[PDB]
Every structure is written in structure tokens, then in C-alpha cells.
Amino acid sequence: IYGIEGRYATALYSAASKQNKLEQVEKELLRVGQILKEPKMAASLLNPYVKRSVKVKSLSDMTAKEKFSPLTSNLINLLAENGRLTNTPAVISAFSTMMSVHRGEVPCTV
Amino acid sequence: NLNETGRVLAVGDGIARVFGLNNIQAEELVEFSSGVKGMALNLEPGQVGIVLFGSDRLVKEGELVKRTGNIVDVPVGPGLLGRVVDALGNPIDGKGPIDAAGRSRAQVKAPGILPRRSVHEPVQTGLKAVDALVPIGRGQRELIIGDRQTGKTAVALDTILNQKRWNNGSDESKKLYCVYVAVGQKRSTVAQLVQTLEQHDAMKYSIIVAATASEAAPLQYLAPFTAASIGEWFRDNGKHALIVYDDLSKQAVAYRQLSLLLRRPPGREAYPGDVFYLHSRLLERAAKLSEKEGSGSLTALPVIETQGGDVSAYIPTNVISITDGQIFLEAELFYKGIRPAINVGLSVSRVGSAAQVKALKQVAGSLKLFLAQYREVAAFAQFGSDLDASTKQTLVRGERLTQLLKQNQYSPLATEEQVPLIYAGVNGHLDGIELSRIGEFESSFLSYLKSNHNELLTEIREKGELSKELLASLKSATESFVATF
Amino acid sequence: TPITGKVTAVIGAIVDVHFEQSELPAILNALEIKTPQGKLVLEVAQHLGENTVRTIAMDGTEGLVRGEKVLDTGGPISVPVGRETLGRIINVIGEPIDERGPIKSKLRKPIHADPPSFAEQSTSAEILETGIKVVDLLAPYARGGKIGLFGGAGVGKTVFIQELINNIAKAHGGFSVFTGVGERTREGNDLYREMKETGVINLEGESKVALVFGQMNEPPGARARVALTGLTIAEYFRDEEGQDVLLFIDNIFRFTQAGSEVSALLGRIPSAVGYQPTLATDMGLLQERITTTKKGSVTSVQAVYVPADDLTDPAPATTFAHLDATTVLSRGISELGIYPAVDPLDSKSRLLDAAVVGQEHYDVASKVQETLQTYKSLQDIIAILGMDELSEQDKLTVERARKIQRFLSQPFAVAEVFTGIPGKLVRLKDTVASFKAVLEGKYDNIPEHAFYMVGGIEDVVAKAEKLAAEAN
């Protein structure tokens, strides 16, 4: 945990919270973690042979067949836009702490 | 954990991307589990680029890597004298460990602007064509550029052999230790070279650094730099050193190889952008030190290999700009019988007469200028027109001076033997002799003085100059010999 | 348990193999793949990472399917060594290709091995008489030394070697190793005929030479390793047997050429001219192994190809430094009809020294060069003005020069089917006296034609007399 990296999820799920996709964005984010642990993935999520806008397309295959698509079909391109798919697992962790602050930050009148 | 260690991610072509090592320095030495050492040149967050000093068939993915904590250095001191070491400074001649006095880094800052002295000390190369036209000076770097199979190494080699005249002496400030740096050459040749040095008892004051082609590219690249530190040693302890690089042309090819393989963008002809900075921070390391520093000095004889006689090339121009002149050698002159084939037209010395011996300075003043006139007249008589007394007179002498400059390899001539010959040339005592006679004339004339007029040779040697009296006797000694036979 | 893997990519002569196990085979190792046609051998090149490796095919990769199973060998490509290889044609892989049964050898060493130590280096200055005028007079070869035969296409590099084998291999006494790297498959067959007829290689009897081929028809991987295969066999007789060996290679250029085809696919940044960055090293490791050591002597005759007749090309230009003798052929000389088209000027050797070939031999040679040189320096004038404008002294040197040049030619027994003239073998002793006699001006009366394609100096005067009867 740090802040800037943790804000990525909070700045993407922030909109998700308004809807309540924390489950579709927190459970999905968990996927990005396993994808990095995948040896075969390391040769694709960090391969400078693909491109800047090409590799982003192949991502959809791991975004429409993993869990992503909604609150993760944006963070996916962003996570692989600059190349932050090395220490991204740290961003997902913050989501678990930021996803719990959204429950209290709501008009609890009922 | 990974601060002092790392795991290899990829390896091939002498390159190894290791992961970890977040406390290793720039250009720091490292050691793999295999035993093979390596050098870190590219520092990146993801991985570290390292170059291998040995084969890479031993490194494999996931291997452990350890650091040395120290910048790649080499043993230095008198001990190396007569020994043959490699880039790193390890013995390769098989004659025991290297007994060094200190250890200095590969990359050393060039001497200061303040601690310098103008070059005034000559460097007897034993080559008449050289010591008369383009003299060498303790503290300068005289290039030896030319095509393959011309005589580049020759010039250098004979120089070392000539130093035997003073290294066997007692005086230190007069001696001159030699450092040959073989780079790109085959072990066969190096072996034969070192054999030749011994055949002349020249190995005792000579240090050799071997970086044959077979070795890894990083060795050939580091070879010159480490070798320079070896020589710098004398420079600092108030002694004189003479390093010869042969050749920087190969070194750049080697250094080009690390760049391309480390995926570093090429400049022109694939050479790294800073390819200039490769030879600049090398040659500048040799210079004459201040009296406060020790009056020490380091002379450099860089060697370059042109293609098809094209000096307009990328690497050669880079070095011509740094060196204090160059001894151009043409293949075409070699066959014509000019050996060594030194083109005076293009060979110059920036230090000039300052470095030349005072005695030899007198006997040959406008000699280089005269040889320029000769080629001017030689080209103009091509027309096939008759020549008057003037254009033929200079043509007669100019043609013989060129024949007097021809000297056999492995045959260095003292100063006391060069002065007399040049004397009889610039004046005009050879004009009345046939061209195919100049040959034996040299040997005969020398034997004449060593037998009769030997006193004069002894004065020229010690004094190193020509007095009003010495000229008189020398004048009469010449004319007397011409009359003989 | 045999280590096994699966293919992940197949681009040309480059196949990427992946291993599930956490144990990966080192570099320079072999691999095998089961096929209906036989077995395809691979060679590790570099570890791309992620338990994936990059390898170089040894044969055609047609039919290879992604994910196919790949078996590991456990050692770098090895080849049988010993007297058992003699009289047998070995393939790049190290298997018989002459259909005469498997080579039952005692030991089998790998093609990859480190170059001799500096202390192991042994130098020699012994002359080697070939019988070739333009050589034994100008750039004589040395015993157990390195020989190089540069030249463009169709200049006479092989035909030059063939003669060397017809004159040295016979009266040698040791062993020989011929290795055709990237050459006409046809020349190999005809070479086989010659070895049989001459009796150098007797099927029923014994033989004096081993035949290793990696012809151009074979893919790049093979054209790259073949040179190593042939060399491994010869270094055996050098250390193990410690006997004189003649190593004939043709052509050595294919070695770097074959490596520059794959360097691109390997993912290397092309150096200038397209050649791979590591040209100097690779070529280095090869030449450093082909040398004489304190255990045995080896005389190597390597032929080098010159792309677009350019000697400044990085390939040949890095070859000169690895040779004790260099004999360059210029197509500008062969077109004149002069053969061999040796260029006396460019040709160099290490034996051209009076302290070896004798003082007189040194002087005669030098005079020949100067004379030839003076003819070249006036060539520009000749085409423009002519000899009429040449001075008396210059005009005499030209004719004499032109006489010396034509005299350099020599009928080759191997090339008799081209010249229609029986071979002519000339001794070094007679050659020196011959030119020396021409320099003295003792044959300025004889016409130039009488010097063309002539063997012995006696044959010159003989041929001059025959031309008198033909004049009508």
C-alpha cells in the first residue's frame, strides 16, 4: 500500500461504487493478480514485441473470458497503457481497504 | 534478499538480463554461480544488463548472481614487467602469480590541465624516416594509420627494440618502458611477437596485454583501458612509459558488439553514439606531467586499420582528430621499394622539432620541405620534357634522399648513426653517387667512422648538439670518405 | 527420465522450444524431434526466458506442428572421431551419408570446444613447396600454417586448392580432412571420384583423408555447424594422435553467411551491411581452433569468398588477420587469361623474409614486385596516350613487366580440361633462377607470347623456337 497506485483502483472503482460494482471490480482486480503470477502471462503482459495499441486488443480476450468487462474493461487498458503490470498486485490490495470505506460513506438512514 | 543477489531472466550472445541487484553500482563486476564473471552496463528497474567475460553456455535461467562491490580494476606495478597478462591482469604466460604493488581502476580520469608540461623529451624510434621527419615526444600520441599488410606494427615494434640502448643503463630518467596491447589479433601472432621481443632481450622492459579475437567482446573492449592504467603507473612514479595500442579499430568493433546486444541504438555503421568518447578518454590519459607530479610521462602509439586506403572513414577520422599527428603508411609505396612506406606528404607531427633531437634538428631543417619539392618535381618530369640544371639537381638529390630513408626492419639505428647519413644527404655529397650504391654506402660509411672518426660519434652522442668545431671535423670526415674508393 | 518439451513457434530455420519441467538444457545443446521422414536435430542458441528457449534447425522445418513433443539429447552435437572416420563421408550431424554402414568409432567428441591456450601456441618458420610459381616465389606457405585463398566468383579458389591436394596430400604422410561448406553438391561427388581413383580413399583398403560436407543446398543451421564438425575431427589427430594433418576448407565464408541469415530471426540488431553484430567473435572462435599446437601440427587451406569482389567487406576483411599467408585472386587478372589469377601485389606472406627464403630469393622477389608496380602506376597513361609517350627507361620496364606477368601463369594438371595443356610442376629452386634471369635482361629478345602458360624456364626458349616455324 502507498497511495498513488492505490488511488488507481479508488479512482476507477469510485464510479463503480456509485453503482455497487465493487464486486465486479474487486473480484475482477483479483484476476489481474493471478495473471501476473502466471509465467506464461509475464511473457505477454510485459512483451515489448506486441505494441502500444495491439497488446491492448489481446487483453480483451482476458477481459471477456476472465471476469473483467464492466468495471475492469477500462482499468485493463489503463493497467497495460503505460506498463504498470509489474506491481499492480499492490493496487488490488488497496481496493479491499477502499472497498470497505464505501459502505460507511453512504446515507445510512434506512 | 535480492539486494546483493539476483536471478537470471535471459541469457545469450554473451548478454545476461539478471533480475534483482538493487544495490549494484554502474560498471560493477559480478560473479555467476557457474564461475564466470560479468559486467553490468545497463541499469534498469525491471532487470540489469550484464556482459559476460566468458562463454554463455554455462549461464542458464534462474541462476544465482552475486556482486563484487568494486569497479573493474587491474593489478599494477613493476612486477608485470616481462609478464603477459589479460584484460583483467591475470597471468597467461604461465610463470607464477602477478606480483603487483597496487591496483588501479580501468577507467581513470585524464591528468589535469594544471599538472602538465610541454613535450621536450625525444623518443628515439630508431627509424631514420621517422626521427628525422616526424619525431616522437615523451607525452604525445603519434598515430600509425594505414591499410592491412603495410608496416604499422613494424614502426612500433622497432621502437621498443631501440629502447634497449637506455633500459640496460643505470639512469632512470632516460629509460623508457614499453606496453604492447594486442587486441583482435590471433594467439598465433601474439606468440610470435613475444618470441621476437625475447630474441632481442626486449621482453625484460616490456609488458604485453592480450585480448585475442577468441576471447569475449567485453575483454577486447576493456583491454586497452586496463592496459593504460598499467603504464600510467610509471608516469606517476616519475618514470617514462610507452604504450602501443594495436588496434583501436578492432576495439570499436568489439564495443559495438556490446551495444547492439544490449539493445542500445546504433549511430553510424552500427557504432554506438559515444564511439568517439571511447578513444578520447583513452588517448588523453597519456601526457607529460608537471615537475611537481614527478616529471613522469606516457607516450601513445594508437594503430588504425583503414579499408582501401580510405582515411575518410568513421573511426579513423575520430582518432586523427585526437592524436598529435599520424604516420600514414601506403601499400603502393611499399612495392615501389619505399620501406617503411611512410608517406611524408600526409605524415606530420604536431609537436614537431620540439620533440626531435637538437643535433638531428640542425642537419635536417627544410628536409621535409625539400622532399615536398621532390614530389613536386617528380610529378612534373612525368611530362617527358627535358629538365634544366635546377629541376634536375633537386631531382637527383630528392631521389636519393628517398633511398637513404629506406631502412630494414628489426634494425634500429642510434642517433649517432642517423645524423651523419642525413648530413651527407641534405648537403649534396650523394648526388655524385649511383642510386643502387646508396645501399652499401650507408653501411660502409658507418664502419668508416666507427674505425677512424669515432671521436666525433662520441661527441654527438653525449652533447647531442653540433658545435662550431664538431661541424668542422664532421665536414672533413665526410669529404675524405667520398674521395675514398 | 528423458527431459521433454513442446514447440511454441516455428519461423524459418528458427524453432522456439518450451519445457514444462523446471530443468532447462544449457546452450549449444542438441535436440531431436520424431518425424515420419526421420529425426530433426535442434541446437540451443539462447534462453528467451519463461522456460522457453530459442534453437536453430539442422534441417527443413516443413511439417513441424506447434506443440509437438521434443526430446532432449543431453549434450552438444557430437561427432565420431578417430581413424574410423577416414574414408567415410560424415554429415553435419555426425552420421554416415555414403551408405556404407555406421561409423563404429571408439570416442565421440562435441563440435563445440574452447581454443588452445596462449602458452600452447607454437610458432614455426618452415617453408612448404607447392610447385606453384606465383606462390613459392612471392608468398610461400608455411608448414602447419594458415592458408587463405580470397577471390570473387569464378576466380580459381577451389581449382587452386585441388592442385594443392594433388601435390601435397599425395606426398604428405599424415592425415587429411576435407570439409565443403556451402558448396556445389556436384563438386563433392566429383571430389569423391578423384579420391578413389587417385587411391587416397580405398573402400576395400585404407584411406588418408576424411570427408565432411555441409553443402549450400543444406539449410543455414547446417552450413553454420558443418565447419565445426570437420574441425573437431582434425583436432583429434592433432592432440590425441599428434600427427601432421591437412585441413582443407571450402568455403569458409559460408560460415558467417549462414549465421547472418538467422541473426535476424534470433532478434539481433543488424550491424552495418546486414552482418550480425558478433561477426568478429564467432569468426574468432573458429580460426583460433584451427592452428598448430605443442601436441601436433596442422596445415589449413581455407578458401574465402569475396562478395561483389569487395575486399573491404567485413566478412573477408576480418579473415586476413587470421592467416599466415594470403593469396588473393582478382577477376581483373583472370579475365586477362592469366591463371592462376594471383595478384602479386596484394598477395602477402610471413615467410617472405631473407632470413628464411634466402637473401637472393628476397631480392629477386622484390625486383619482380617493383617492376610489376611500375607498370600499374603508368596504366592510366597507357590507356590515354600509349607507350609512344613513355620514356625509354619506362617503356623497357613495361615490356619486361608484361613478360613477368605472363610468366606467372602456370598450367594446372587439374585444370587441363580447361587449358588443354598438360600440368606443369615447377620447383622453387628453378623458379627463382628463372625470374632472376629475366630481370638481368637475358630474354628481352624472346616474344611475350612465349611466356604465356609456360612451366619451366627451359620451356620458354623451347616454345619461342616453335613459334618461328609457325610464322608465315
Ligand SMILES: Nc1ncnc2c1ncn2[C@@H]1O[C@H](COP(=O)(O)OP(=O)(O)OP(=O)(O)O)[C@@H](O)[C@H]1O
Ligand atoms: N621495414 C620493412 N622492410 C621490409 N619489409 C617489411 C618492413 N616492415 C614490415 N615488413 C613486412 O611487411 C609484412 C607485414 O608487416 P607488418 O606486420 O608491419 O604489417 P601490419 O601493419 O602489422 O599489418 P597487420 O596489422 O595485418 O599485421 C611482414 O611480412 C614484413 O616482412
Ligand SMILES: Nc1ncnc2c1ncn2[C@@H]1O[C@H](COP(=O)(O)OP(=O)(O)O)[C@@H](O)[C@H]1O
Ligand atoms: N589454374 C587455372 N588455370 C586456368 N583456369 C583456371 C585455373 N583455376 C581456375 N580456373 C578457372 O576457373 C573455372 C572454375 O572456377 P573455380 O576455380 O571453381 O572458381 P571458384 O573459386 O568460384 O570455385 C574454370 O573454368 C577455370 O577456367
Ligand SMILES: [Mg+2]
Ligand atoms: Mg599488425
Ligand SMILES: [Mg+2]
Ligand atoms: Mg569454389
